Amino acid sequence: EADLALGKAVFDGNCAACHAGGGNNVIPDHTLQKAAIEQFLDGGFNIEAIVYQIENGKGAMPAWDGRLDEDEIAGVAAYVYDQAAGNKW
Ligand code: HEM
């Protein structure tokens, strides 16, 4: 169901590794923030754009293609989007 709690559970395990509290450890300022997305993200503040990054891996970010399920992928994207939009970073 591309759930946010699912998305969180994924995030917490998989993404937090580099992005702890939306907190990009590799490129300090390239955080999971709305603003940071809208500047740095190529594809803009769009679910498509988010998902695409997570799938395919981009710059210094690993690809999650087939490592996460489709729903899982969608959930983590949705969650990140919700966090950003809501400012729950
Ligand atoms: C876990 C599956 C995971 C998610 C979710 C995630 C999201 C994410 C987004 C949405 C961006 C864009 C942020 C912005 O535009 O400012 C992004 C960017 C980077 N990530 Fe990430 N990310 C997840 C996992 C990981 C892992 C495990 C690493 C660390 C090895 C990592 C690193 C990075 C880096 C670097 C970037 C910037 C690269 C770029 O977009 O050019 N991510 N991530």
Swiss-Prot record:
Post-translational modification: Binds 1 heme c group covalently per subunit.
Compartmental location: Plastid, Chloroplast thylakoid lumen
PROSITE patterns in the cross-refs: CYTC (PS51007)
Ligand binding (heme c): 15, 18-19, 61
Keyword field: Chloroplast, Electron transport, Heme, Iron, Metal-binding, Photosynthesis, Plastid, Thylakoid, Transport
Pfam family, one: Cytochrome_CBB3
CC annotations in GO: chloroplast thylakoid lumen
Coiled-coil residues: none
Main location: plastid
Function text: Functions as an electron carrier between membrane-bound cytochrome b6-f and photosystem I in oxygenic photosynthesis.
Family: Belongs to the cytochrome c family. PetJ subfamily.
Subunit structure as annotated in this protein's UniProt entry: Monomer.
Protein name (database record): Cytochrome c6
Lineage of origin: Eukaryota, Viridiplantae, Chlorophyta, core chlorophytes, Chlorophyceae
